[PDB]
Every structure is written in C-alpha cells, then in structure tokens.
Amino acid sequence: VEKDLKTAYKALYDEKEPLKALHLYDEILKGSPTNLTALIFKAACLEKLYFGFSDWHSDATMENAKELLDKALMTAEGDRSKIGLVNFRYFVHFFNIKDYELAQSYFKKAKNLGYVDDTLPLWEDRLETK
Amino acid sequence: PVEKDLKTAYKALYDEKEPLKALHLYDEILKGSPTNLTALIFKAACLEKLYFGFSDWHSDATMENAKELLDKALMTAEGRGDRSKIGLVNFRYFVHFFNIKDYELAQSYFKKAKNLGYVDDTLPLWEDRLETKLNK
Amino acid sequence: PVEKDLKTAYKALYDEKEPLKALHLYDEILKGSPTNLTALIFKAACLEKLYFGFSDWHSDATMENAKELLDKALMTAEGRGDRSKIGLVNFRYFVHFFNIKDYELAQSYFKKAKNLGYVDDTLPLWEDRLETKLN
C-alpha cells in the first residue's frame, strides 16, 4: 500500500496527470477503503478534474470530493497529525471553491492541530490576498 | 418489504453518501420489482454520482445506462397515466441533461415537469441555476 | 481527422467564442492524441478564457491546470527538439502570465520566444502593450 500510494502521489503532483492518479487511488481504495491518504488525495484528483475537464465539471464531482474528505475526517478522528492533514485538505477544497471564510477556519484548525507543510507560508499569503 | 428496502437504499445514496452500496440495493429492488419508479429513478442517480466520482465509472456507458433507466421510468409512468410520476420522470430527465451540460434539452424537460404540475421546494434554486447556465 | 477536429475546436474558441464547447472538443482530441501540441496549448487557452468568464471556473486550480498543460506542451516540444514549437509554447506562457498580471514573468517568456525565433504578426502590438504595463 505504501509503494502504491507513492506511485499515485507521483502521478497527481509530479506527472501532473489527475486521471491516471484517480484510477490508482480507486485501486488502492478497493483494497484499503479506510486509507486516509487514498481518501484525501482521491478528493484532490476530483478537484483537479472538476477544474480541468468539461466531462468532470459538475457539482457531483465537488460533492464526491467533499464526501471523501468527510470520510477521511471520520477515520482520522476515529491520529492528531493525520486529523490536522484532512483540515488542511478541507482548506484547499474551499480556497478553490472561492469560499475563503470556511477555508480560513480549516486553515486555523490544521495549524492548531500541528500540521507541518513547507507550502503553508505560500498558502497563508494567498489566503491573506483573497 | 419494498417500502423499507427503498428507504435503506435512499439512505445509502443521500445520507451515507455511498452510491456503490445504494446502486446494488436498487439493483436488488429492480430484480423483484422491475417497474418500480423510485428504484429506476434513483438507480440512475447512483450511476450519475459514480460517473462523476469513480474512474472505472467515468464512461459514456454509465451515463447511457442512467438515461435508459429514465427511459424505462417514463414508459412505466406513461403506461399508468400518472401525471404526478410523469412530471417526476421529466424532472429527473432535466437533472440528467443539466449535469451533462445539455441545457437546451434540460430547459425542455424542466418546462414539461412544471407543466405536468411537478412540485419540489428546490425548483426555484434549479430555475435560477438553469437561467444562469442558459443566459451564457 | 485530427487536422479538421483541431480546426473545429479553434473555431469554437475564437470565432464562436464558446470556450466550454471548445474545451470538450480539445479534451476529445487529447484522448486520442495526448501529445498534440495544438490541443495542449489551446486547451490551456480554453481554461484561461473560462477562468475569466465563469464563476464556477474562477479558481487557482483552473489556472494551475492551464499552466500544467503548457508545461506538458514544453515537455513534448523539447522532447522533439522543435525550436519552432518551443518558441510557440514560450509565447503561450507570456500570454498566460500577461493575463494573470505577472508582467515580470511575461517579459521573460516574451524575450525567450523572440530569442527562439517565434514569428507572429501581433508581436509589435504585444511589444507595445507589455511596454505600457511594464513602464
């Protein structure tokens, strides 16, 4: 699962191929349905596809992404750093759906839970700008 | 019974937000009750959610299957002469064509459903959404 | 064929001025021809037009996807060694950054394209425009 998740992350963020990464996360989630990384990054794929493909640009894709984050919060709450990650992911979900009010709330939640990421200062300034 | 089984399937799709669990609960209802409008209409809803949420479901075949389930629903509703259920099928058609960005056809089914007396508290929200997509 | 399909997609975006129709058409070309530079470059143009014309598309994710399509285009162009197509992708980058008001980065890509021998009849109009925003 560790190697399979690494190959899927590389497809989404390095290769910048969300359709390939989506398939890879679906396969992981077939075997491991409560895997937080697969649930969190499948939502990331769906958010990228919504904003990059006509056939994916529908409320159903965004609803599915939010529901995957909801399922991850359930599992994470059921790991303080992992419970912090989902909150940062909820922030990325709303910074993209233009709701900066809700995004600021999740950004604070993630930071207060001790979420560490080298992109956090770049996100703070972007959130400060919007 | 079918009433309870339909309630469990609706809860799987809209409350639990698990369209794969709901889809097969609806298949089971359609095995015993092939002409059940709720099972036909909401199996198509499952397929629409799966299309937009799973790679292996993101295919024209999935959307074609959803349309064919709505086709079967219109046949049943029209066969009975249930104006109420015909309006509902026509509204579900509008929703299908709205999500596949065919706003021209969706507007036609929206008018059909409204003219058949379809009542839904979400109709003003849909009316404004369709007016925004159709004004561009 | 791909040549006719690309022509219909270009007409949908620039003549018909329907970027959502053109987007679908470019996605279809990219399904069969993933490394087609014209489909890659103009799918990014669609996404750029949608960003600036639709509330539901006005997101950083849309601009990120457009930039990533231009990135994929530079990979393909550089993979072949096509100086012409490398120059074109750099001009397309200048437009991307010019439109998102990052004139510092746009000036860099405009020079890169001109130095790669990019030929376009609109270059003096752009040269005069970029000089106004950068002055």
Residue numbers in the entry:
A (entry chain A): 3 to 80, 83 to 134
B (entry chain B): 2 to 137
C (entry chain C): 2 to 136
Sentences from the paper on this structure:
The N-terminal domain of Sgt1 is predicted to have a helical TPR fold (Tetratrico-Peptide Repeat) and is responsible for the interaction with Skp1. Skp1 has an N-terminal BTB/POZ domain31 that interacts with Cullin1, a structural subunit of the SCF complexes that arranges the substrate and ligase subunits in close proximity, and a C-terminal extension of around 35 residues, that folds around the helices of F-box motifs.
Crystals were obtained that diffracted to 2.8 Å of a complex comprising Sgt1TPR and a truncated construct of Skp1, Skp1BTB∆. The Sgt1 TPR domain comprises 3 TPR motifs, each of two antiparallel helices (A & B), and a solvating helix (κ). Skp1 sits within the upper half of the concave face generated by the Sgt1 TPR motif repeats. Residues from the α2-helix and β3-strand of Skp1BTB∆ form the interface with residues from Sgt1 TPR1A, 2 A, 3 A and the capping helix. In this interface the α2-helix of Skp1BTB∆is amphipathic and forms a bipartite interface with Sgt1 in which half is hydrophobic, and half is electrostatic. A pivotal interaction in this interface is a salt-bridge between Sgt1-Arg93 and Skp1-Asp35, and our structure-guided mutagenesis experiments using full-length proteins show that mutation of Arg93 alone is sufficient to prevent Skp1 binding in vitro and cause loss of viability in vivo. The yeast specific insertion between TPR2A and 2B of both protomers contributes the majority of the interactions of this interface.
